[PDB]
């Protein structure tokens, strides 16, 4: 088995996206994200692809895979996959492909997943109807939660690192 991983950043309340963007500034999260995903396949939903600045995509040093129901969708510098099953196939021999968002794609991949790396951001965001939300993890997941750390931005964050099987 490839060890299928999910990686995301959420507010304590579970928001991951608002108005198409990440609704906070925590540089340290992007560092952790890169440190987690470098050298691996990164699988993402079409909307997440379009949320990435055009100048920042595809993510360098990683095989980019975009999931869309449209067989003719084009993602320059990425492979387009018609299902999470097809995306995982494209990861080939990668021992640890990572699913990197967003909300709909996390729900799709969750049944396949054996690792989650979650950054929690201490910011008071009240869930709105149009927010993208993190999936809820049940207690079949085990691992560790680090201490709260001060970001350069003045917010606190911490890492959660879970596995199952």
Ligand X SMILES: COc1cc(Cc2cnc(N)nc2N)cc(OC)c1OC
Residues in contact with ligand X by the rule CB under 6 A: 7-9, 22, 29-30, 33, 48, 51-52, 100-101, 119
Nearer to ligand NDP, 63 or 132 (CB): 132
Q: Which of 25, 68, 114, 161 binds ligand NDP (CB under 6 A)?
A: 68
Is 51:17 a contact under the CB 8 Å cutoff?
yes
30 contact choice in ligand NDP, ligand X, none (CB below 5 to 8 Å, kind-dependent): ligand X
Binding residues among 83-122 for ligand NDP as defined by CB under 6 A: 83, 100-105, 108
Q: Is the peptide bond before 102 cis (omega within 30 degrees of 0)?
A: yes
Nearer to ligand X, 9 or 80 (CB): 9
Nearer to ligand NDP, 22 or 59 (CB): 22
Helix/strand/coil for 118: strand
Alpha carbon distance 117, 162 (integer Å):
6
Report the b/e string of 75-95 with b at 16+ CB within 10 A.
Answer: beebbbbeebeebbebbeebe
52 contact choice in ligand X, ligand NDP, none (CB below 5 to 8 Å, kind-dependent): ligand X
Number of residues that this document lists for the chain: 165
Q: Which stretch binds ligand NDP (CB under 6 A): 66-74, 90-98, 144-152, 153-161?
A: 66-74
Nearer to ligand NDP, 68 or 151 (CB): 68
DSSP notation for 18-70: BTTB-SS--HHHHHHHHHHHTTSEEEEEHHHHHHS-TTT-SPTTSEEEEE-S-
Site residues (vs ligand NDP, CB under 6 A): 8-9, 16-17, 20-22, 45-48, 51, 67-70, 73, 82-83, 100-105, 108, 132
């Amino acid at each position: 088995r490839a060890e299928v991983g999910l990686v995301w950043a959420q507010s304590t309340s579970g928001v991951i996206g608002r108005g198409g963007d990440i609704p906070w500034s925590v540089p340290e999260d992007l560092t952790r994200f890169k440190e987690v995903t470098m050298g691996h396949t990164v699988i993402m939903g079409r909307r997440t692809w379009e949320s990435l600045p055009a100048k920042v995509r595809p993510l360098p040093g990683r095989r980019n895979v975009v999931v869309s129901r449209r067989p003719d969708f084009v993602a320059e510098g990425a492979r387009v996959a018609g299902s999470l099953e097809a995306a995982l196939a494209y990861a080939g021999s990668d021992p640890a492909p990572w699913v990197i968002g967003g909300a709909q794609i996390y729900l799709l991949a969750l049944p396949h997943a054996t690792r989650c790396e979650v950054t929690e951001i201490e910011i008071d965001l009240r869930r709105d109807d149009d927010d993208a939300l993190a999936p809820a993890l049940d207690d079949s997941w085990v691992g560790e939660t680090g201490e709260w750390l001060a970001s350069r931005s003045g917010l606190r964050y911490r890492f959660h690192s879970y596995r199952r099987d």
